[PDB]
């Protein structure tokens, strides 16, 4: 019983964090094999010019007390790809994957090249995440673990004026096309991911929370017309709810009607501790936490 936003265990990723310092700048890097990846703003902008006048010896890269020699540096989008003189023997089996809006992953928040905290997040429709980071957090990785393979999907880059957080993928591509520049950028509007809200309500039912459950139904078509005027995403397919609908005996259409009434008001009650709809849980997370 219960539903909690949780992270996958961080041990295999902890051994990959390094401190990367250049001049007056210090942040985190990800050490895999003989390469360290970090946000390129550590050398700050004309980033190509910055790279062109780099002195390799002005780097200080360390894993705990172990310093790494810098062999070479190349640009990789919004990242530096830094070749170092030692292989990380604790490199896990890994992949890279760019995540899509609505998908969950884990953040390992790091400072001074050491992991400080771990928490789960979900990529918003405007390509930002609801993080907690202060200065020095850049280079903190986002990851998922599948079959012991670590899928790296995020390296922290910056915070927007509103306080929400933007990273790049490990290919160096900034999520949402935000610039790694100290300029005025404002994140786009975001909508609640209806598919995730549905997952949350199924979790609520499985946990005995039913007070909000509509007798009424709304067809997916009609809901989607309401959704786009009311800050929620459209539902196109409902395959991801077959298991949960079978486990509970409640179909998506009844939950969609419930969403409509709960979007405006929870009326002073709570659902699993929440007083407003949440879209931070995917169907995958819910199925895992309910059924293993």
């Amino acid at each position: 019983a219960g539903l909690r936003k949780m992270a996958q265990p961080s041990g295999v990723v902890e051994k990959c964090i390094v401190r990367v310092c250049y001049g007056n700048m210090a942040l985190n890097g990800l050490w895999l094999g003989d390469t360290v990846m970090c946000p390129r703003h550590v050398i700050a902008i004309d980033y190509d010019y910055a790279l062109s006048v780099l002195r390799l010896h002005n780097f200080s890269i360390s894993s705990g007390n172990v310093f790494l020699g810098v062999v070479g540096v190349t640009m990789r989008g919004a990242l530096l790809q830094i070749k170092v003189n030692q292989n990380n023997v604790h490199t896990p089996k890994y992949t890279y994957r760019t995540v899509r809006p609505g998908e969950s992953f884990n953040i390992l928040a790091c400072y001074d090249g050491a992991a400080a905290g771990v928490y789960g997040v979900n990529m918003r429709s405007n390509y930002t995440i609801r993080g907690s980071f202060i200065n020095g957090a850049a280079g903190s990785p986002g990851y998922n673990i599948n079959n012991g393979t670590v899928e790296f999907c995020y390296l922290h880059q910056l915070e927007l004026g509103s306080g929400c957080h933007v990273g790049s993928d490990l290919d160096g591509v900034m999520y949402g096309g935000y610039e790694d520049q100290p300029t005025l950028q404002v994140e786009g509007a975001s909508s609640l991911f209806t598919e995730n809200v549905l997952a949350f309500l199924y979790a609520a039912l499985i946990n005995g929370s039913t007070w909000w459950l509509s007798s009424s139904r709304i067809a997916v078509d009609r809901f989607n017309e309401w959704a786009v005027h009311n800050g929620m995403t459209t539902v196109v397919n409902t395959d991801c709810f077959s298991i949960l609908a079978a486990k509970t005996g409640v179909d998506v259409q009844r939950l969609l009607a419930s969403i409509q009434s709960l979007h405006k008001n929870f009326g002073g009650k709570q659902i699993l501790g929440y007083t407003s709809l949440t879209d931070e849980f995917t169907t995958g997370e819910v199925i895992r936490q309910m059924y293993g």
């Binding site: 210090a26 942040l27 550590v42 850049a138 910056l158 935000y178 790694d180 520049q181 100290p182 300029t183």
Partner: peptide, 7 residues
């Protein structure tokens, strides 16, 4: 002012 979170 975007804040690039380097220390």
């Amino acid at each position: 002012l975007a804040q690039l979170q380097v220390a």
